[PDB]
JSON list of C-alpha atoms in Angstrom, two decimals:
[
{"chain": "U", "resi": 1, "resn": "UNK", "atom": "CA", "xyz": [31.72, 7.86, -42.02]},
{"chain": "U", "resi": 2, "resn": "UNK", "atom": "CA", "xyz": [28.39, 7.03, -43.56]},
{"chain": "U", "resi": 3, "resn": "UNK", "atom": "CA", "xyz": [28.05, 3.33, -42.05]},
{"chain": "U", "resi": 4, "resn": "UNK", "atom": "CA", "xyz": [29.29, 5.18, -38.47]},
{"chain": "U", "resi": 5, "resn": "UNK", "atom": "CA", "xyz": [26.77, 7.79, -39.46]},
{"chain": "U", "resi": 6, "resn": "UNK", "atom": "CA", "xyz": [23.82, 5.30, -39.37]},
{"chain": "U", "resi": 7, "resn": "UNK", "atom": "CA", "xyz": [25.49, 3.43, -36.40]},
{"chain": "U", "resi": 8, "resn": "UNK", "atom": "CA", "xyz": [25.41, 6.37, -34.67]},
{"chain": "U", "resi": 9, "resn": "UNK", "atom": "CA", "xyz": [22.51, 7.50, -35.14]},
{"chain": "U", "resi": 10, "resn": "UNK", "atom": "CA", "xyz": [21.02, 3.86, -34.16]},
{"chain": "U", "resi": 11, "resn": "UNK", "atom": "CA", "xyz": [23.07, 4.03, -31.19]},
{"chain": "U", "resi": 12, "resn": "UNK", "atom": "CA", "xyz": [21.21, 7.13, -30.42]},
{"chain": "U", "resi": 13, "resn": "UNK", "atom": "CA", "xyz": [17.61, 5.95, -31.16]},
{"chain": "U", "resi": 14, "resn": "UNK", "atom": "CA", "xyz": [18.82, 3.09, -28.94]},
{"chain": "U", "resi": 15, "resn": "UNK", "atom": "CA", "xyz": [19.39, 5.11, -25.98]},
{"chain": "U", "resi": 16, "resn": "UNK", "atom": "CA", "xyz": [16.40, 7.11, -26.96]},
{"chain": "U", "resi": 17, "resn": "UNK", "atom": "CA", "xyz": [13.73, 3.56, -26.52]},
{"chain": "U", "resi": 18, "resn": "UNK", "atom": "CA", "xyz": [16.02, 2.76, -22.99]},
{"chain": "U", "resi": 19, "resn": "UNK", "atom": "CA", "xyz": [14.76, 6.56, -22.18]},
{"chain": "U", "resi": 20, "resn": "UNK", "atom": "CA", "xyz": [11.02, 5.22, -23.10]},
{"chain": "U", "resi": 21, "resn": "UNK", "atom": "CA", "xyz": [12.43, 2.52, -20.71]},
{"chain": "U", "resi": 22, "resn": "UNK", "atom": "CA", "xyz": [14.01, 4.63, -18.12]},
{"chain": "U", "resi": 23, "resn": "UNK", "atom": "CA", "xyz": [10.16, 6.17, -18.42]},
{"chain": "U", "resi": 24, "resn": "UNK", "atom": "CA", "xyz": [8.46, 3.56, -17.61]},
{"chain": "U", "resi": 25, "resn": "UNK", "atom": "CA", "xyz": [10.67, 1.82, -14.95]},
{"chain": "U", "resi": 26, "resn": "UNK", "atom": "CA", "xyz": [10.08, 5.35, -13.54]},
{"chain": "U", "resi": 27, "resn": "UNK", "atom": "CA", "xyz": [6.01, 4.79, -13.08]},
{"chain": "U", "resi": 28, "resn": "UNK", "atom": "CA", "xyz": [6.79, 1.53, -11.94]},
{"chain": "U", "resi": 29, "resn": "UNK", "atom": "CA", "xyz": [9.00, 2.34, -9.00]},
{"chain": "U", "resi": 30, "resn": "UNK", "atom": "CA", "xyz": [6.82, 5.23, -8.33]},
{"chain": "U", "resi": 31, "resn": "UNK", "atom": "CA", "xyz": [3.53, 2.96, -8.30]},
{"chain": "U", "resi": 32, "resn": "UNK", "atom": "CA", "xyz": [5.41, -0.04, -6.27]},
{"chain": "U", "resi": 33, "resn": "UNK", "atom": "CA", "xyz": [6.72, 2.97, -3.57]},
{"chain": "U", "resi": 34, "resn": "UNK", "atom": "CA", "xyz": [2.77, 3.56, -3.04]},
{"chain": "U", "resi": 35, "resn": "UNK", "atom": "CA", "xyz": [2.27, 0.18, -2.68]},
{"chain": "U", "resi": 36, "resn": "UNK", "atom": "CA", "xyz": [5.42, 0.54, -0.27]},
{"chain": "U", "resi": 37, "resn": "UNK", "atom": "CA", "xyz": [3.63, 2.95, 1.82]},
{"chain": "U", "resi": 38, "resn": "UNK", "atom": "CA", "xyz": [0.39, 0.95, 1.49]},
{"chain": "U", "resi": 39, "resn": "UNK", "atom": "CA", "xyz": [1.89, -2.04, 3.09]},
{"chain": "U", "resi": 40, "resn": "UNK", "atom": "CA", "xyz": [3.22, -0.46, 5.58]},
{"chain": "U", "resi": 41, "resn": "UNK", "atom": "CA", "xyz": [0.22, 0.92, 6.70]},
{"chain": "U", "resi": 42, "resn": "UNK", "atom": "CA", "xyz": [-1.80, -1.91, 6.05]},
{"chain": "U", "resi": 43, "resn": "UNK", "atom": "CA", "xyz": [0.60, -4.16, 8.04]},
{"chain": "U", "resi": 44, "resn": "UNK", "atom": "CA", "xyz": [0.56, -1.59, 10.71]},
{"chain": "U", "resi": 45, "resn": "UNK", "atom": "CA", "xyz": [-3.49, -2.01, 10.95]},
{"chain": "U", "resi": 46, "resn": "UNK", "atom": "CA", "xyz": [-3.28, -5.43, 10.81]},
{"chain": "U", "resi": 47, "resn": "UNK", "atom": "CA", "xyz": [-0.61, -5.90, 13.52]},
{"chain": "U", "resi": 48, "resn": "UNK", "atom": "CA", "xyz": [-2.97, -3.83, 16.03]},
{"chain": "U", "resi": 49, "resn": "UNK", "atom": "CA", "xyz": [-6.05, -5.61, 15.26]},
{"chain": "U", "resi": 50, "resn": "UNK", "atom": "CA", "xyz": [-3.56, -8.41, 16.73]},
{"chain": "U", "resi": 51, "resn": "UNK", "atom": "CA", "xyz": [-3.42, -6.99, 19.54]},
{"chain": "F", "resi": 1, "resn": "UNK", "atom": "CA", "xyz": [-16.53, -31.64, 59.39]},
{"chain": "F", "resi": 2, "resn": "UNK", "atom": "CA", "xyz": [-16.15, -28.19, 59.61]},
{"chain": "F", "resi": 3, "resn": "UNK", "atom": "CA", "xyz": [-12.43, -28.88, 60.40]},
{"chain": "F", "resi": 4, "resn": "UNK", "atom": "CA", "xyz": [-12.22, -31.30, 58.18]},
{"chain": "F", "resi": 5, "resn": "UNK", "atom": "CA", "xyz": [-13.31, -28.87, 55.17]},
{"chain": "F", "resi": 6, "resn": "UNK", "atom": "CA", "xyz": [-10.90, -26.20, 56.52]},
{"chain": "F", "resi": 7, "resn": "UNK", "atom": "CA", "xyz": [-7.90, -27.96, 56.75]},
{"chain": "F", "resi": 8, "resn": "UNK", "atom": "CA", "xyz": [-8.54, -29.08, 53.30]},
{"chain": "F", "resi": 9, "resn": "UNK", "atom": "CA", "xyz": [-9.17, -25.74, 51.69]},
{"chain": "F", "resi": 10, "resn": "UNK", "atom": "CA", "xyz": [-6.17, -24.58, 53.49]},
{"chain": "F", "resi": 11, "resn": "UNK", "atom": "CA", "xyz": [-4.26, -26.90, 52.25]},
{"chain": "F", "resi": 12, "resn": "UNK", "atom": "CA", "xyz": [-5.56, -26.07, 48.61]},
{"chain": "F", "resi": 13, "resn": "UNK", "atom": "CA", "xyz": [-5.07, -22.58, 49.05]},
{"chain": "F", "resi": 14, "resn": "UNK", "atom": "CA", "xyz": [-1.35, -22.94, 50.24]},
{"chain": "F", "resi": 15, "resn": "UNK", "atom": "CA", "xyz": [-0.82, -24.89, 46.93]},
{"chain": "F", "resi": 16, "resn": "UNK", "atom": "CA", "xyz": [-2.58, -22.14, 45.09]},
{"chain": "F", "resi": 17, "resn": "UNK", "atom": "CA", "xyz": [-0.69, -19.18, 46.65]},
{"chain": "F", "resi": 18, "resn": "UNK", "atom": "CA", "xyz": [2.75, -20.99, 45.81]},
{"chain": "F", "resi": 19, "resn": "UNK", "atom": "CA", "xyz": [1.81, -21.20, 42.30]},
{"chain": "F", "resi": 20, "resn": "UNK", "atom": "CA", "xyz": [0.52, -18.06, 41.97]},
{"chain": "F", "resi": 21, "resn": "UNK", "atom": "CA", "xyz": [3.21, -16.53, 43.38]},
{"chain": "F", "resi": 22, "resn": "UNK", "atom": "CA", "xyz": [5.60, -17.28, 40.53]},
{"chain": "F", "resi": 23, "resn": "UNK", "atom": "CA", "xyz": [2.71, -17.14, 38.36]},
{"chain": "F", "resi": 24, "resn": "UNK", "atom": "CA", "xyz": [2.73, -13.66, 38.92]},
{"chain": "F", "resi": 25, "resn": "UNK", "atom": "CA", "xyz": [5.98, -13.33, 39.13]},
{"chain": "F", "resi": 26, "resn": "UNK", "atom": "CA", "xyz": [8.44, -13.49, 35.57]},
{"chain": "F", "resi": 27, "resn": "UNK", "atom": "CA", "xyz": [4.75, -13.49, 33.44]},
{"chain": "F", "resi": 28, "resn": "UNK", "atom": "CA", "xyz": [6.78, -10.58, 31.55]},
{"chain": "F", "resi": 29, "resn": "UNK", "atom": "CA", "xyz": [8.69, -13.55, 30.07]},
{"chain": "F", "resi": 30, "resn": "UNK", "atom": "CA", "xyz": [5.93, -12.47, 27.12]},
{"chain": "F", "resi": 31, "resn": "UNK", "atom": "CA", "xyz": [7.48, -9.73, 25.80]},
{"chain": "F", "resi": 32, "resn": "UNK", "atom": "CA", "xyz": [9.08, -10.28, 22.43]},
{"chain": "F", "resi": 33, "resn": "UNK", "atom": "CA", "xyz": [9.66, -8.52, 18.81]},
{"chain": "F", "resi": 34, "resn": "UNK", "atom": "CA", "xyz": [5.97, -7.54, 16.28]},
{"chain": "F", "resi": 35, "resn": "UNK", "atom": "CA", "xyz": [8.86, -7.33, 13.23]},
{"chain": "F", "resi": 36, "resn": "UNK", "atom": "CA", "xyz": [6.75, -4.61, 11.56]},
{"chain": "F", "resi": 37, "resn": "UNK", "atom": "CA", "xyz": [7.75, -2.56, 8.26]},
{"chain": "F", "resi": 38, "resn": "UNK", "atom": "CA", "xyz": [8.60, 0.50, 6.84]},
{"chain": "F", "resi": 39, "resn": "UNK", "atom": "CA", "xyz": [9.01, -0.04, 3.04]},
{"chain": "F", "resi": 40, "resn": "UNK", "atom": "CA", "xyz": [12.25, 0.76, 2.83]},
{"chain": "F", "resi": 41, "resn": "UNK", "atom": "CA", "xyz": [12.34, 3.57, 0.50]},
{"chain": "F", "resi": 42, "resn": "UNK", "atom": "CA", "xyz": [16.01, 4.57, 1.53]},
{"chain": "F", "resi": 43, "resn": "UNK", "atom": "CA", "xyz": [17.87, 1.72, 0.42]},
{"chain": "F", "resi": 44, "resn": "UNK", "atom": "CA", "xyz": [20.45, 2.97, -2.02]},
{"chain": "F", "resi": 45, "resn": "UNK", "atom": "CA", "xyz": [23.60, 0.59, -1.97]},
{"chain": "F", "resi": 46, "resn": "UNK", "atom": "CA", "xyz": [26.21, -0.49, -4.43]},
{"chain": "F", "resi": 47, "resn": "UNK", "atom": "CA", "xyz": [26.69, -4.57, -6.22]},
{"chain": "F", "resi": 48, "resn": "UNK", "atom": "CA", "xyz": [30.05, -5.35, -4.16]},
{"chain": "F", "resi": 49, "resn": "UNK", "atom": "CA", "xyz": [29.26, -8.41, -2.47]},
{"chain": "F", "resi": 50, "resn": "UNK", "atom": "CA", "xyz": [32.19, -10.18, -1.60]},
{"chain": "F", "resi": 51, "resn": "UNK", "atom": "CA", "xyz": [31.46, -11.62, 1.75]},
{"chain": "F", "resi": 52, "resn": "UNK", "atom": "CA", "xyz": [28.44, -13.50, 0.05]}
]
């Protein structure tokens, strides 16, 4: 059907932009696991200048 | 005064030794938990929380 053509085809543009989505929640969990890593190295510094 | 001195000082050192003694003693009393971190990274679980 022509109006389920174009819904359709928005449907698919719509999980096209939560792809440009999925791509950028991807660089943010990949910066946020450096800053992960970061922490716990920093905290690990931090707890032996403690002692 | 000599005695007089030394019964003193003993008397100060007894009271030191029997503090010391348990001073020495449990002083590992000290040892507890640094709670350091690890990021996490691993954590993969699924939204049933029923018990709260």
């Amino acid at each position: 059907l022509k109006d389920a053509q174009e819904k359709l085809e928005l449907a698919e543009k719509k999980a096209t932009d939560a792809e440009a989505d999925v791509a950028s929640l991807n660089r943010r969990i990949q910066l946020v696991e450096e800053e992960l890593d970061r922490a716990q190295e920093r905290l690990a510094t931090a707890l032996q200048k403690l002692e | 005064l000599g005695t007089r001195a030394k019964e003193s000082l003993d008397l100060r050192a007894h009271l030191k030794q029997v503090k010391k003694e348990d001073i020495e003693k449990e002083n590992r009393e000290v040892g507890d938990w640094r709670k350091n971190i690890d990021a996490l990274s691993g954590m993969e679980g699924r939204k049933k929380k029923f018990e709260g």
